[PDB]
From a paper:
[name] comprises three structured domains connected by flexible linkers—the adapter N-domain followed by the D1 and D2 AAA+ domains. Six [name] protomers come together to form the active form of the enzyme, a homo-hexamer.
A representative 21bin20S model (class #5, 3.39 Å) and ɑ-[name]—2:1 binary [name] subcomplex model (class #13, 3.74 Å). We again performed signal subtraction and local alignment on ɑ-[name]—[name] sub-complexes from all five classes with ordered spire structures (see “Methods”). This procedure produced a single ɑ-[name]—[name] sub-complex reconstruction with an overall resolution of 3.74 Å, sufficient to assign characteristic side chains, identify the SNAREs forming the complex and their directionality. In place of synaptobrevin, a second syntaxin molecule was placed to complete the four-helix bundle with little deviation from its usual backbone configuration of the ternary complex. As such, the stoichiometry of the syntaxin—[name] complex observed is 2:1, the dominant species in solution. Sidechains comprising essential layers repack within the core of the complex compared to the ternary [name] complex. For example, the ionic central layer (0 layer) is reorganized; Arg56 of synaptobrevin is replaced with a second Gln226 from the additional syntaxin molecule, which adopts an extended rotamer to mimic the arginine it replaces. Three ɑ-[name] molecules bind the 2:1 binary [name] complex; a flexible linker between [name] SN1 and SN2 blocks access by a fourth. The 2:1 binary [name] complex forms a twisted, parallel ɑ-helical bundle with a series of characteristic [name] complex layers preserved.
Numbering used by the authors:
A (entry chain G): 0 to 24, 38 to 288
B (entry chain A): 188 to 259
C (entry chain C): 1 to 82, 130 to 204
D (entry chain B): 197 to 259
E (entry chain H): 0 to 23, 36 to 286
F (entry chain F): 0 to 286
The structure:
C-alpha cells in the first residue's frame, strides 16, 4: 500500500534534512530525527528505527541533557527488542548505567528484569539470567520493596536448583519460608517453600533430608499436619529398604489427589533413578 | 451383597471431584491477594510524589507573587 | 466348606474395602471443610485493602486537580506580568452423620462467599474509571508546562 | 432431592469461578495502567523543577 | 417542557452573540467564545446542532495556532455526533486519530480506533469494515506491548470471523491466544475455554480431523482432559459417529443444566448438529 | 569483587576533592564573593558520593555524606532540601546502627510540621514507631508515636488509616495488662465499622477480641457484655466466635478445666490460633 513507500521515502527525506542541518555545523535536527524514527516505527520497518533513535540520543547527550537521552535510549532498545536481541541489551545497559548514576534505582531494577527475561526466552543462557535477577533483587531489597525481592529470589533459587549445586536453593528457600511464616496474610503458603527445600536435600543423601525435615518439623509445628510431611516420611521409609514399588505407589497416589507442577516430577524422577 | 457396596463405591466417586473443585477456588483467592497488595504499595509511592509536586508548585506561586508585586 | 470359606474371605476383603472407602470419604469431607474455611480470611483482607486503595486514589485525584488550577493561575499571572440430607444411607451408622453435617457447613460457607466475591468485584470498575481520568489530567498538565516553558524561552529572543 | 442440592452447589461454585476470572483480568490491566502513570508523573515533576531552576538562574543573572 | 425551550434559546443567543463578536488576537477570543457557546448548546442537548457548532469551533481552532486543543475539540465533536449521522463522526474521529499518531501517542489512537469500530458495528450492519479497525488497534497495542488489549481485540475479531465462516483465521487466533495464556502464570485457568472453542470451529470442516485435533490439545495440555468441555466434546463426537439425534440433545441438555449456553455457542452448536 | 575496592577508592578520592573544595570555598568567597556556586557544587559532590557509597554497600559512609550535605544546604537556608537529605540519611543509617536515624527523622519531622504538612510527619512517625518495635521492646515509645500519628491523621480527616493506627495501639496496650483502653478502642472501631458496606464483613472480629479482653476482668461482666453486642448486631450470633465463647463460659462456670481445654483444642484444630489469642487464652485459663 501507500504506507510502506510513502513513509519510507519521507523518512529518508527527513533523515537527509537532519543530516544537512548538522552539516551546517541543533535541536531541530533532533526533532527531525525523532519524527523520522516515529514514522519508521509506523512503517513496520522495525530495524533501523533504533538506529535513528540512538543517533538522536547521542546528539541530545552532546548538550548535557540526560533525561530525554535515557528515555530515547530505552525506546530504541525496546524497538530493537524483536528485530535484533543483542543490541537491545547494550542499549538497555546504557540506560541502566545512567539511571543508576542518578540513583533512580527502581527504574534500574525493571530494566534488569527485562534484560534477564530476554536472556531467558529468545537466547539460551542461564548464568546471565541469574546474575541480572540477583542484581535486581539486591536493588529492590535495598529500597525495601519486599514482594519484588521475594519474587526475584524465588526465580533465582528455582534456576539454581534446576542446574547448579543445591546449596543456593536451600539457603534462599529457608530464608524466604522463615520470613513468610510470621506474616498474617502470607502464612498459608509457607509450607510450599519448606517442602521444596527438603526435596533438594534428598538429592545429596537421605540422612541430610531426614535431619532437615526433623528440624523443620520442630521449627514450624503446622508442618507436622501437612500432607507433604506425610508423603516425605513415607517416601523416605520406602527408600530405606530398596523397594521401588512402594516409591512408585506413593508418588502415584499423591499425584492422583493433586497434579504435579512438573518440577516435583523432575526431582522425584531424579531421586528414584538413584535409589538403585 | 455385592451390588449395594459397589453402589457405596459409586457414592465415594463424586466427593473427590467436588474436593478438586474447591481446591481450585482456594488457590485462586490466594493468588489474588498478592496483586492487590502490590497495587497498594505502588499507589502510596505515587501519592508521595504528588504531595511533593503540589508543595513546590504552591511555593513557586508565592515566590512569583512576591516578585511581581514588589517589582511592580 | 472350602468354597464357602473362600467366598466368605473374599467378602471379608470386601468389608475391608468398605471400611477404607468410608474412611477416605470422611477424610475428604474434613479437608474440604478446612479449605472452605481458609478462603474467607483472604477475602476479607482483600476487601479492606481495596477500600484503603480507593481512598488514596481519591486523594491523588484531588491533588492533581489542585495542581492544574494553581499552575494555570500562575501561568496567567506571569503572562500578565509583562435440605433433608446429602448422602444415601446404604448402611447408616455414625460415619454418615458427620459427612452430612460437614457438607451442610460447606454449603453455607459457599453461600457467604458468593456475596463476598460479588461485593468485592463491584469496586474495581470505579477504580478503573478514576485511574483512566487521572492519567489524562496529568498528561494535560505536563503538556501545558512544556509549552509554557517553551514560550517563556521564546519571548526573550 | 440429591440432584437439586448438588446441582445448586455446583452452580454456585462455577459462578464464583467466573467472577474471579473476570475481575483478576481487570486487575492486571489496572496494574499496567498504574505502571505507566507513575513514570509520567515523575518525569513531569523533574522537568518542572529543572525549568523553573533555569528561570531563577537567568532572572538573577539579569538582576 | 419549559427546560428544553429555555436552554435552546439561551444557547442560540450565546452562539449568535459569539458569531457577532468574532465577526467584529481576535481569533483566540473567537475560539474561546465559540467553545462556550458550544458548551451551552450541549447543555441545551440539541445533539446535532451542538455537534455542528462544536466541530465548527474545532475548525476555527485549527485556524488558531495549536494542535492539542484541535485534537481535543475533534474528539469531543465526535462524541457529540455519536448519536447522529455516523459518517461525520467517523471522519472527525479519524482526523483526531491521525493527529494523535502524528505525535507518537499510539495508545490513545488505539483507544479511538476501538471506539469507532464499536460505533461502526452497533449502528450499521457492515461487519467486515469493523474488522480492519479492530486489527489496526490490535497491531498498535501489540507494538506497544500492552498484551491485554491485544488479546481482547484479537478475541473479538476472531469471534466475528468465526461467525463469518472464515474458520481458518479463527482457529489460528484461538490457538495462539490459548497457548500464550497457558504459558503465562496468570490467566492459565482461562486457557481451557479457548481450546474448546477452537475444536468446535475445527469441527465445522470435518469430523475425523477433530479427533486428531482434540488429541493434539490433550497431549499439549494434560489438564484439558479433566475439564467438562473435553468430556462433552468427545461424547458429542462419539454420538455423531452414529446418526442418532437423541444422544447429543441429551448431552447438551445435561451440560446446559449447570450453566446457560451463550448465543454464539448455541448458534454454532445448532449449525454443527443439524448437519 | 572489584566493586568493593574500586568504589571505595574512587569515592574516597571524590570525597577528599569535595573536602578540599569546601576548604577553598571560604577563601574564594572572602577574596571574590563567588556566592554559593562553590557551595552548591560541593553539595553536588557530596550527594554523588553518597549515592555511589550506597551502591557500594557501605551504608555508614552514605549516611555520613548525606548528613554533611544536609547540614551545608541547611546552612544555605534551604530547609526543604535539608529535610530531604536528612530523610535519606535516616534511611541509610537504618541498616547499620539504629539510633542516628531516630534523631535525623526527628529533625525532618520538626522541619515538616513547621509548615503544616502533617501527612508527611505522620508517615515519618509511623516509620519511627516501626523502628522502635522491630529491634527494641520499648513498647511505651511505640505507643506514644502511634498515638501522635493517629491524632494527626484524624486531624486531616483521612479515615481508615487512623483506624489501623488505633487498632495497633489497642493491640499493644492490651499486652501490658491494662484492659480499659483496649476495650474502648475495640468497641469504638467495631461500632464505626458496622455501618460501612465493604468493612461490614470484618466487623464481627473486633467484637470478639473485646469480649476476650473483657473476660480477664471478671466473668460476670463478660456474660452481660455479649448480650449487649448480640442485640445490636444480630448476625453476630451466626459466627463461630459466639459459640466458642458460650461454651467456654459454660465450662468455666463449674471449674471443669478439661472441657475448656478440649474445646480450645478443637477450635484450634479447625483453624490455627494466633500468638495473641494463645497468650490471652492461657492467661484466662490461669483462673
Amino acid at each position: 500500500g501507500m504506507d510502506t513507500s510513502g513513509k519510507q521515502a519521507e523518512a529518508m527525506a527527513l533523515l537527509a534534512e537532519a543530516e544537512r542541518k548538522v552539516k551546517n555545523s541543533i535541536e531541530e535536527a533532533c526533532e527531525i530525527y525523532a519524527r523520522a524514527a516515529n514514522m519508521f516505527k509506523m512503517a513496520k520497518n522495525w530495524s533501523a528505527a533504533g538506529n535513528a533513535f540512538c543517533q538522536a540520543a547521542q546528539l541530545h547527550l552532546q548538550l548535557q541533557s540526560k533525561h530525554d537521552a535515557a528515555t530515547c535510549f530505552v525506546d530504541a532498545g525496546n524497538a530493537f527488542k524483536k528485530a535484533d536481541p543483542q543490541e537491545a541489551i547494550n542499549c538497555l545497559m546504557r540506560a541502566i548505567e545512567i539511571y543508576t548514576d542518578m540513583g533512580r534505582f527502581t527504574i534500574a531494577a525493571k530494566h534488569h528484569i527485562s534484560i534477564a527475561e530476554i536472556y531467558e526466552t529468545e537466547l539460551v543462557d542461564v548464568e546471565k539470567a541469574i546474575a541480572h535477577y540477583e542484581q535486581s533483587a539486591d536493588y529492590y531489597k535495598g529500597e525495601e520493596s519486599n514482594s519484588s525481592a521475594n519474587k526475584c529470589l524465588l526465580k533465582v533459587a528455582g534456576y539454581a536448583a534446576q542446574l547448579e549445586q543445591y546449596q543456593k536453593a536451600i539457603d534462599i528457600y529457608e530464608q524466604v519460608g522463615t520470613s513468610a511464616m510470621d506474616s498474617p496474610l502470607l502464612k498459608y503458603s509457607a509450607k510450599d517453600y519448606f517442602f521444596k527445600a527438603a526435596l533438594c536435600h534428598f538429592c545429596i543423601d537421605m540422612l541430610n533430608a531426614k535431619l532437615a525435615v526433623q528440624k523443620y518439623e520442630e521449627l514450624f509445628p503446622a508442618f507436622s499436619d501437612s500432607r507433604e510431611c506425610k508423603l516425605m516420611k513415607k517416601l523416605l521409609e520406602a527408600h530405606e529398604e530398596q523397594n521401588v514399588d512402594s516409591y512408585t505407589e506413593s508418588v502415584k497416589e499423591y499425584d492422583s489427589i493433586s497434579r504435579l507442577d512438573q518440577w516435583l516430577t523432575t526431582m522425584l524422577l531424579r531421586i528414584k533413578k538413584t535409589i538403585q | 451383597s455385592k451390588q449395594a457396596l459397589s453402589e457405596i463405591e459409586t457414592r465415594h466417586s463424586e466427593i473427590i471431584k467436588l474436593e478438586n473443585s474447591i481446591r481450585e477456588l482456594h488457590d485462586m483467592f490466594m493468588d489474588m491477594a498478592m496483586l492487590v497488595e502490590s497495587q497498594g504499595e505502588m499507589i502510596d509511592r505515587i501519592e508521595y510524589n504528588v504531595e511533593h509536586a503540589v508543595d513546590y508548585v504552591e511555593r513557586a506561586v508565592s515566590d512569583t507573587k512576591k516578585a511581581v508585586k514588589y517589582q511592580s | 466348606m472350602a468354597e464357602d470359606a473362600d467366598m466368605r474371605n473374599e467378602l471379608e476383603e470386601m468389608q475391608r474395602r468398605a471400611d477404607q472407602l468410608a474412611d477416605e470419604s470422611l477424610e475428604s469431607t474434613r479437608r474440604m471443610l478446612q479449605l472452605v474455611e481458609e478462603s474467607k480470611d483472604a477475602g476479607i483482607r482483600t476487601l479492606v485493602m481495596l477500600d484503603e486503595q480507593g481512598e488514596q486514589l481519591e486523594r491523588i485525584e484531588e491533588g492533581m486537580d489542585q495542581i492544574n488550577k494553581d499552575m494555570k493561575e500562575a501561568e496567567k499571572n506571569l503572562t500578565d506580568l509583562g435440605s433433608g440430607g446429602f448422602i444415601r444411607r446404604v448402611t447408616n451408622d455414625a460415619r454418615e452423620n458427620e459427612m452430612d453435617e460437614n457438607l451442610e457447613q460447606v454449603s453455607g460457607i459457599i453461600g457467604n462467599l458468593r456475596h463476598m466475591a460479588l461485593d468485592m468485584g463491584n469496586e474495581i470498575d470505579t477504580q478503573n474509571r478514576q485511574i483512566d481520568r487521572i492519567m489524562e489530567k496529568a498528561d494535560s498538565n505536563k503538556t501545558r508546562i512544556d509549552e509554557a516553558n517553551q514560550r517563556a524561552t521564546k519571548m526573550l529572543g
